[PDB]
Amino acid sequence: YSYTEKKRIRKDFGTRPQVLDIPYLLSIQLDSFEKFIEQDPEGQYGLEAAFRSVFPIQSYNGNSELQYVSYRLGEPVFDVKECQIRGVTYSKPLRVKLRLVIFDKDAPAGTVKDIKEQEVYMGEIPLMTENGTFVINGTERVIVSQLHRSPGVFFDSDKGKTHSSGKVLYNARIIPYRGSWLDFEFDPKDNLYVRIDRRRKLPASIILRVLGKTSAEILDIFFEKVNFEVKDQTLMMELVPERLRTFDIEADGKVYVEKGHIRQLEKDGVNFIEVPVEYIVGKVSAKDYVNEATGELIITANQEISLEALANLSQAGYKKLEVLFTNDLDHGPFMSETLRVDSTTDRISALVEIYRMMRPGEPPTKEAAESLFESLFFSAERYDLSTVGRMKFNSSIGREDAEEQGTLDEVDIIEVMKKLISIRNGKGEVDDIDHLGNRRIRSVGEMAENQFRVGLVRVERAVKERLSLGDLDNVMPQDLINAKPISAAVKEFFGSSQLSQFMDQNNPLSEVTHKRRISALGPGGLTRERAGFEVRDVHVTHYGRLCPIETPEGPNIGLINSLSAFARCNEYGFLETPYRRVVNGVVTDEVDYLSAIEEGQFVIAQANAKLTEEGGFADELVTARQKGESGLHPREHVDYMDVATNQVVSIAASLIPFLEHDDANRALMGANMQRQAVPTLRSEKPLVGTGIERNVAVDSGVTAVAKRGGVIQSVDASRIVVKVNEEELIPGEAGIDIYNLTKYTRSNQNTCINQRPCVMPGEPVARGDVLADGPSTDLGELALGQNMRIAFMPWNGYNFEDSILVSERVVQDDRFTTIHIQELSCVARDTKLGAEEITADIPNVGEAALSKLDESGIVYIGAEVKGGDILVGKVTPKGETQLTPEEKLLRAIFGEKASDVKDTSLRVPNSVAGTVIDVQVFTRDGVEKDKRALEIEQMQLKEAKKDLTEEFQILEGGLLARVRSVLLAGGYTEAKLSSIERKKWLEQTLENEELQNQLEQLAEQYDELKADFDKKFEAKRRKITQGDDLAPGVLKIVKVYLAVKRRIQPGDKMAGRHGNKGVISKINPVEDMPYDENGQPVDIVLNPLGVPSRMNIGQILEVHLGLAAKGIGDKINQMIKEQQELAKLREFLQKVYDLGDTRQRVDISELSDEDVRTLAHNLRAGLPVATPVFDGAPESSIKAMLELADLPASGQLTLFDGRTGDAFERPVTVGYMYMLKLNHLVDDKMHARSTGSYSLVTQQPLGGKAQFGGQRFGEMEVWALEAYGAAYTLQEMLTVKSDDVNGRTKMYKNIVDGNHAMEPGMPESFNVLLKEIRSLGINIELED
């Protein structure tokens, strides 16, 4: 047990040993980006692959070429934190070495006349943070993986749902990574057709002709030949035994049946069979037969033989005739009938027809047609069957060569035709389009490479254009390429892509789930109005790869999936899952990662399989699965076993306790709902958990984990400094590590990101120990909600439907109070009239509203502000305004007139009250810095220097401690050293060479230390002082951060982990809520009526187990308060941890006394218990835990009404449940509007809370009003509330006058309608 885990050991109710620890949860991002960025000396991945795919760049003439040598990434100008502060992309420069080689025209081609080496800037590549995120434009974003179709060939069928009859029609489709598509279909007339890029159908014999296949060659490839001879004036059948097994059969010694088994007669074996002449009439010729004397073609290939033809070849002297095989069951004439409907007879006609279907309405020439067909499929530039596509193609056709090829050929096409014909015949089966070996995962590295290659090609076009000119004497490689298209491509992908999404940052679980999300949408994927039911279902190949529970509920169901717990992506982009090998009947420790294709063959056992002490199965027949079907299989035929019980579900589903007792619908809802939880002021562990929380908390990156072990030298709410052990220190290092903690930083969802220390000064810490807990973390465990006392009963209708009744004590204890940080920005721009100024001289505003602003016009840090308060004062110059005469009179009477500038200042939004916690000022380079900006700059520089000096102090303490350790290897008295003053140590004089040399060395080292410290602080000051790159026309920006405490209230949404959501209906006083015999009231009352119909039973079990856990915690609290002996504390803890026949062996005898005190203290608020999914605590264990805590075995208590004191007539289920506060707050959803802004064109009220918009009265509302008969209300909504411009002002005036009458007119939208219809050249008008 690690130190962090030893502080609070969670009781494990699991019973099956875990043989493979869960892998790092963010591997899918980091591995892909490492593939993209790291140098690949073999050149199959990433920037090297793209560079080799585009370069070398060859001029059309051949004069010169540009070649690639190597690439490197520069150092970032900024790190992650200040990239976030300023609002710039965290990236690295791309520097590539290119050589311009100029050939000699006089010399033979290939002569190196000159070379020019140079390094060139090729754009800026964004970098992944250590947590798998990108910082683009100052915002954290995650690029989600895409599930697409693997390149290659897919054979499908219409399943007999197109033609009038069944007639299942078969088709084949080849798709490359880049290039054109090809299709080969069957028609209801059994003819094979070709489509190129989904245009007009063609006979499909054209392509074979293009490659140069004569009709005889086609017939030879696509059919078997049966022969005929003229032997001794008799017809002569070359007999193949397998064919025979309506006429009289020859071989009189072994006469077969005549015009009415086969194997017995074929056993002897003869090669002579005679057939009637009529058997030739129906056959079709297989060759072209020429007569030299006549000079003509007696019979053509693919022609039916006739009696006259037989006579003609009889006179011609030909004795051997071979014809095609044709049946109705195993072999077909499909290709021959295809040839019959083909009008092309040569290669040139083939290219002509292909060109006409490609480019209709264009004069076809031979050279253009040849270029078009070569570029369609046999050109490396426009076609790429990538490595994965090539392997899938080869495996589909069963071809065992050309692994590195990237283009099609004769062999590929002909094998595709042969397979499709075979599937028509009956041999072979169509492909499964949802099978996970047919769908591929494409991650951030692949699409970054793709977009980089697009930009590279964009550069290469212009580079080729320039190189072709010829004048290249004074050109350098950096003068030829164009970095801006490359930057445009990478910033397109990282800023405007559908898969590059705003990071979900409600809690660590939201982050982890977003990084492990697979979307079938996006470029090259599915669209939601064109994705059917089949793609949305759970395929049988999703077992262990895609979670069947976690998917959005709505239009996106089945299209967004979550990676399973142990899922991985192989080197080709296909998901694979680990399994334990079974050898000699024992289930071993060795693990193997299997893909979807491999999984089908073997028989795989489940983690629930009973095992013996020898490592084998207990039952003779074990429940396993094979080819996607479950069943009972013999013990000896099992080849694999599952590695874990949570192998099928995702992390969010793995965090649901008692998942096996919940219906899949409510488990889906709970998994989706755990990611919407908002962190609270205090984070509390879940009493009932699954044992996964530590992994999520550690791998999310929200916590501060120790890179090296040691002792915590210094602890403070913003810093942890640890002294590393001697054994793990790098030679010549300072020996100390510094962790700066994030304090009250806004998240992407306007929540609070806070890191709190969890260590002591002097506490021993090892590698991997948690030092600080981030949001929703408690001692290294994920903490999404709070443990709440729960009673299942109805209460006077206040828990009707899904409503929740909450005690006032919940609000008093601030258990669900959240901190929300909001950004407000005031930008002073440059306008035509003048420059907007930030100042405290605000017209028409008194000193009451200027209390909180400083001299510069910016609020102070720590100012408590409410709605309408001025944060930053700004005045904008305004032009002349026409004063109405009856205001000129008022100006005359009272002479006040001050309208030079207009007050456009930043104000707190209505119904928003909070504290200003940070103010930042950004000033354009060349604009005067006001007093406040100077103050921020001074404080920033002071804090930077203070932090740098603090580091220097602590690291110098560590370094001098190591030097003292080196000196103590001999051992002397340092009092003599301290007798001389520290600086005076540099003033000593030594005459011995041995001592003097050391003195000079020390002096030089001290000088170098001073130099490096000066350089570091100079660089930091340069970073702080540089002006901001503000947008064109922008003079200044001020940003104010407001922190708001939000308390729970009616209308807020609360939920558990089992899909049980609700809205708080009332905050009940404590004296009105049910209480037990000890006077302790419940905290939340839930409706029992919602449990049985939704089949989410894990919540009742969670309630019972939580009751038991809190009872055990109360027992520990009691045993500590009475100061009982340590022996009995140890005995109780050991009894608690020994309950049940679990896999956990916790021995308190090996914990020290202080360790036992710490553990007992951390168990005061309840004993945390782990119930892993599908390996959870049974009913008996829960009841035994209840009896240990002296609680009823039924989990039901007697409760009393606080309003009356009368006991309820039945026992009530009371326990503890983990509740969450979802980010659906009534503060952010309450909206109302009387009159506000209006649209520019439609003159209708805007939409949304941000625009102070109005609710939409849609078509269905109008139908409802029509059904009622409310003509006047409908007219009000149509005219005087939306777009009757005069009518709405008249209505406002009348309401102010207390009249309540309207004068409806014509809506503006109808006038716009008329204007557009007239603009379409149609006379529409109104008649009177």
Partner: peptide
């Protein structure tokens, strides 16, 4: 066109117009 629908409370109104166009 923002007018009263010829159903329910507005019905009578439209009937009146059908009289006026009749006369």
């Amino acid at each position: 066109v923002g007018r009263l629908i010829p159903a329910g409370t507005g019905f009578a109104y439209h009937q009146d117009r059908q009289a006026k166009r009749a006369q």
